[PDB]
Amino acid sequence: GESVAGPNIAAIVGGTVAGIVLIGILLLVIWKALIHLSDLREY
């Protein structure tokens, strides 16, 4: 009734929200790295 991880919605909401935030930060870091790479790059 409540087991059936119905809250899978909740965990999905929870897991899904967390994953999106994680990707967003991860994407942002790489983007920044590429810019640093272009400037850091001597040559």
Phi, psi at 28, each rounded to 5°: -60, -40
Distance separating alpha carbons of residues 28 and 18, to the nearest angstrom: 15
Count of structural domains within the chain: 1
The radius of gyration of the chain's CA atoms, rounded to the nearest angstrom, is: 19
Q: How far apart are CA 30 and CA 1, in angstroms?
A: 44
Phi first, then psi: give them for residue 37, nearest 5 degrees. Answer: -60, -40
What CA–CA distance (Å, rounded) separates 37 from 31? 10
Helix (H, G, I), strand (E, B) or coil at 27: helix
Q: Which domain holds residue 2?
A: 1-43
Measured between alpha carbons, how far is 2 from 14 in angstroms, rounded to an integer? 17
- Largest CA-CA distance found in the chain, in angstroms, rounded: 64
